Design an enzyme around this catalytic site. Structure first.
Site, PDB file in Angstrom:
ATOM      1  N   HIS E  28       0.801  -1.218   0.000  1.00 56.38           N
ATOM      2  CA  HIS E  28       0.000   0.000   0.000  1.00 56.38           C
ATOM      3  C   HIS E  28       0.837   1.273   0.000  1.00 56.38           C
ATOM      4  CE1 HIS E  28       0.244  -1.842   4.086  1.00 56.38           C
ATOM      5  NE2 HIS E  28       0.752  -0.660   4.386  1.00 56.38           N
ATOM      6  N   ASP E  50       0.536  -9.391   1.579  1.00 56.87           N
ATOM      7  CA  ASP E  50       1.723  -8.542   1.401  1.00 56.87           C
ATOM      8  C   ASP E  50       2.951  -9.381   1.045  1.00 56.87           C
ATOM      9  OD1 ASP E  50       2.903  -6.008   1.195  1.00 56.87           O
ATOM     10  OD2 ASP E  50       3.738  -6.154   3.219  1.00 56.87           O
ATOM     11  N   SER E 102       4.651   1.878   8.102  1.00 58.83           N
ATOM     12  CA  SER E 102       4.212   0.511   7.876  1.00 58.83           C
ATOM     13  C   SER E 102       5.408  -0.414   7.669  1.00 58.83           C
ATOM     14  CB  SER E 102       3.287   0.438   6.662  1.00 58.83           C
ATOM     15  OG  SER E 102       3.979   0.782   5.476  1.00 58.83           O
TER      16      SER E 102
END
EC number: 3.4.21.90
Lengths: 151, 52, 151, 151, 151
Positions: E28, E50, E102
């Site tokens: 993302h 992911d 992240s």
């Protein structure tokens, strides 16, 4: 004591007093009693004796007790002073007795309520009180001096 | 019947255009009572008189 | 100063300011003011100039005075700090500029309210406030910088 | 713990504890929660367990963990005493367990919620109290003794 | 440890950790890697797990050893604090949970990575983290809470 005032538009304009079993509120004032317990009780109309329904719950009953006849002249305490008479109330000096003083109980030396003040804002040299009274044998009457403007 | 509907519709449209001008006549001046008002914008275009 | 906030679901999401004669409230917030006297006021919606109704009675009017003309660009008072700009608003640091801080007045050195904040959450290292004020002759104007989200 | 009690006509009538996953409120008792944040919870009826739907937001949920099944027969701290049994409920000293104070959680020495009381007012010299419990594998089972009375 | 921030337009917006056998990077986020020898890594999109391609050679292999299943609910070495739960992430306090960080790993007491964070900006009073876990035998699991904005 136990006397919850009535507020209209966020302003105190009258006082409601509770006697044994029943609550008494003047009907010439408008608003809503701030107690959530008191606001669930219905209101019924009467004369200028100013009656309200005594549908109080069991946990609060017999707060203040009334006084019967054989009432002396004596000296009776008052929330902004003192009153010493029997046939009427004492004509208190000026300054005392503004606006929003209706429904205040007049008590004895033992806490017994003998009167509820309704009218008589100005009475010349000293201001007489237009109250409700229990008569010589236990019947409620209403005493008014002439030219007594309501509160 | 078609004619009287046109006059009725056009009357309440222009008078709501004039009421919106009436509401905006006074709105820049009600939030400040201390500000002075001109005499042109008081009586000719708008309605309000001098007060307070 | 006296500034009653606005309650909605227990949290505070806005503030309502009182100037001389009139009561202010932002349109972007929804809720009831904590003052029960102010709840009976018939506030009316309007354009971006934020016109409301000062229907309060005589007993508490003129809490503070709105600032007149001849505006210098020097020091000004603020609840979370200080601002130092007249044509714009100052680049205040972080902390102030979050959420639910609308309606807070901006006062002067004599206690005179100059502006009321409405937006400008964050614009990088320099944050600009979208306020209302009077430009030259007391006419209420609304100044909004670029990218001013409702704050 | 933070367990908000129910209110009915001023006096208390029961305690509505908050457990993570679903808040617990007895439908045997009545009233409304005075907290504004818990007043927005939708009142959904349930089975005979006297349960209220747990629509609490997740941030203030799971502040009070609940004990699982296979409990020891050792000590458990009641709010006004101590219970030491596993299958049945041990005797409590007499006097406690009147009317309108049910719903108080029975906790452990680790502070985890073990059981939620619903009944057990007076059951002789040996005070047994009707409770909900987790039987062997997490099944929520209500156990009521012989001659039970609602609380 | 060994983690690499992702360079996008001069500011940090994500962290690309490396596990023994396969490197990782959040899908993302976007930008350029901060290593010259990681520029030959083939970028690809994948599912919600992911998943990236760790085609780094043997010269910088075996950096952070992975951890198996049966993770205890004890203390964990989070970069800005600690996490003390297994099935769910621990309720981390305010301040932590900003933006653009992240892919930060969670370490064990033995210096082993057990998880990679993905999101959970803010939930209110507490904060829940959408993190990856291994369920029972080493199968990769992506776990998310309700209303988790990516972070």
């Amino acid at each position: 004591d136990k006397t919850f005032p009535i507020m209209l538009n966020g302003q105190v304009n009258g006082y409601a007093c509770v006697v044994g079993g029943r609550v008494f509120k003047p009907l010439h004032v408008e608003g809503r009693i701030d107690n959530e317990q008191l606001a669930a009780i219905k209101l019924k109309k009467a004369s200028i004796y100013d009656l309200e329904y005594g549908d109080v719950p069991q946990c609060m009953k017999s707060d203040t007790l009334q006084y019967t006849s054989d009432k002396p002249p004596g000296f009776y305490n008052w929330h902004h002073g003192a009153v010493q008479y029997e046939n009427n109330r004492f004509t208190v000096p000026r300054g005392v007795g503004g606006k929003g003083d209706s429904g205040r109980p007049i008590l004895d030396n033992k806490g017994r309520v003998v009167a509820i003040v309704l009218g008589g804002v100005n009475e010349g040299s000293r201001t007489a009180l237009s109250v409700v009274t229990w008569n010589q044998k236990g019947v409620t009457v209403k005493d008014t001096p002439e030219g007594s403007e309501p509160w | 019947c078609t004619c009287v509907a046109i006059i009725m519709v056009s009357c309440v449209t222009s008078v709501w255009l004039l009421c919106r001008t009436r509401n905006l006549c006074i709105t820049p001046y009600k939030l400040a009572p201390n500000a002075q008002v001109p005499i042109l914008l008081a009586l000719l275009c708008c309605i309000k008189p001098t007060r307070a």
